[PDB]
From Swiss-Prot:
<keyword id="KW-0808">Transferase</keyword>
<protein>
    <recommendedName>
        <fullName>Methylmalonyl-CoA carboxyltransferase 1.3S subunit</fullName>
        <ecNumber>2.1.3.1</ecNumber>
    </recommendedName>
</protein>
<comment type="function">
    <text>The biotinyl 1.3S subunit serves as a carboxyl carrier between the substrate-binding sites on the 12S and 5S subunits.</text>
</comment>
<dbReference type="GO" id="GO:0047154">
    <property type="term" value="F:methylmalonyl-CoA carboxytransferase activity"/>
</dbReference>
<feature type="domain" description="Biotinyl-binding">
    <location>
        <begin position="1"/>
        <end position="77"/>
    </location>
</feature>
<comment type="subunit">
    <text>Transcarboxylase is composed of three subunits: 1.3S, 5S, and 12S. The core of the enzyme is composed of six 12S subunits. On each side of the core there are three pairs of 5S subunits. Each 5S dimer is attached to the core by two 1.3S subunits. Thus the total number of chains is 30 (6 + 12 + 12).</text>
</comment>
<feature type="modified residue" description="N6-biotinyllysine">
    <location>
        <position position="43"/>
    </location>
</feature>
<keyword id="KW-0092">Biotin</keyword>
């Protein structure tokens, strides 16, 4: 009982920001630290780095899309 947050492999967002551009895609491999997506929180470009090494199995964020703090941004495998 309680949905709207990452934890099951999904990378939780640090805060409520707007999706500007996506770097990683379903198929590309990412590393713990490499940028995966850019978020514009409070008219400020924020770089989103992967929490751990893995691969993008599903992108839970698209351009011109608003995300909530904690909400799963991208699923890593």
């Amino acid at each position: 009982a309680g949905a709207g947050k990452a934890g099951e492999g999904e990378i939780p967002a640090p805060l409520a920001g707007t999706v500007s551009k996506i770097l990683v895609k379903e198929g590309d491999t990412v590393k713990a630290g490499q940028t995966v997506l850019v978020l514009e929180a409070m008219k400020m470009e924020t770089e989103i780095n992967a929490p751990t090494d893995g691969k993008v199995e599903k992108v839970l964020v698209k351009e011109r899309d608003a995300v909530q703090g904690g909400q799963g941004l991208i699923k890593i495998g």
